[PDB]
Specification:
2 copies of one chain form a homodimer.
Chain A: H1 2-42, H2 48-55, H3 58-61, H4 66-72, E1 75-81, E2 91-97, E3 109-122, E4 128-136, H5 177-188, H6 192-204
Antiparallel strand pairs in A: 1-2, 2-3, 3-4
Helix pairs in contact in A: 2-6
């Protein structure tokens, strides 16, 4: 009865998937007003987000050059919105900057929209397999003259702002934007105050 | 400017996040528990389901699984994770049900680990309290057959998978991170078990 068991498991997986979306929607509906209120507070705390970004671990620091770091000193807020009603896992990530030497004033909010799609591809046996793909349109940033931080092309080591050019649509790119999206949306953004408070306690200890 | 007010307002908000999280965990348990129960009755019929899952779920588990562990786990018929404390959805009862085997006495074929939570405060070096979540658990005595105990007796041996049952979370000396394993089992391995099994069953050879 292996055949009947596995067919029943596949039916049940569909019900797990519907429950999961239901829970994610409920979670977003409860957390959304709290993240909005928190956003308005964090906007007043200078250098809050650069402290958080530098305390979050290798997942972020692997990308941060010290030129990244001086621009991030002007970062005023990170906000993560689950903007897609049918898919709670889609995120729109907004980085709001104060005026600075890298960005034109008309592009002080950098907005990245990442969409999550369950797709299918045949393996070497010939069977379809379910894969989760995160994809995103590239974001043109209106850099001030000579201050771009987009890679000329995809051999030079990536810095943090190359994320805005990551699309997820190239089995050629070395920049793992899916893992960075998940880290930003599920770890760094929800735990930001803890990261900041821990970094402050930690740095005054020395 | 006005940082004292900002950080006081953030602390009030953290309390509301905490209450929201508990509500979401309760809702999650009420939606998923009946599906985990139906799934449990199916999985008991599938040979080697859980040993394959344990070995395919990533380094967090496989760092503990030795070949002697693995032979016993072939007899594992089911893993179940129950959020048994209605007011604290994060407490878990993790049950491993075995078929008769050469390691466990027949009167001890279900291994039950209960892991509870303490939200507690500890002083940092300045003297301020900090909120920490601690997992703790009673040690579980297992009735091993002669010569087949899989408990280490001291800390020169690296812990193996069954050392989890002796982990208490109450010891500063410990190298065994049972809290991270508890969270992994309850939130990653158990909800995703069929996917892990199916991916293992579709793995290709290395040559």
């Amino acid at each position: 009865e292996a055949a009947q068991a596995f067919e029943n498991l596949a039916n049940l997986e569909q019900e797990f998937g519907k429950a999961e979306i239901e829970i994610l929607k409920k979670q977003n509906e409860l957390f959304q007003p709290l993240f909005e209120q928190r956003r308005d507070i964090l906007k007043t705390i200078n250098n809050f987000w650069v402290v958080v970004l530098e305390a979050a671990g290798d997942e972020i620091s692997q990308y941060i050059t010290p030129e990244d770091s001086v621009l991030l000193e002007k970062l005023e807020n990170i906000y993560v919105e689950r903007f897609n009603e049918k898919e709670p896992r889609d995120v729109r990530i907004s980085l709001t900057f104060q005026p600075n030497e890298y960005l034109q004033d008309d592009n002080l909010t950098l907005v990245k929209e990442v969409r999550m799609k369950e797709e299918k591809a045949k393996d070497d046996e010939g069977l379809e397999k379910k894969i989760t793909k995160y994809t995103s349109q590239p974001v043109d940033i209106h850099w001030k003259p000579g201050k771009s931080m987009f890679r000329k092309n995809k051999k030079l080591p990536p810095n943090f702002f190359d994320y805005f050019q990551w699309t997820g649509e190239e089995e050629d790119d070395d920049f793992d934007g899916a893992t960075l999206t998940i880290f930003l949306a599920e770890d760094l953004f929800p735990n930001a105050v803890k990261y900041f408070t821990e970094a402050m306690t930690e740095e005054a200890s020395d």
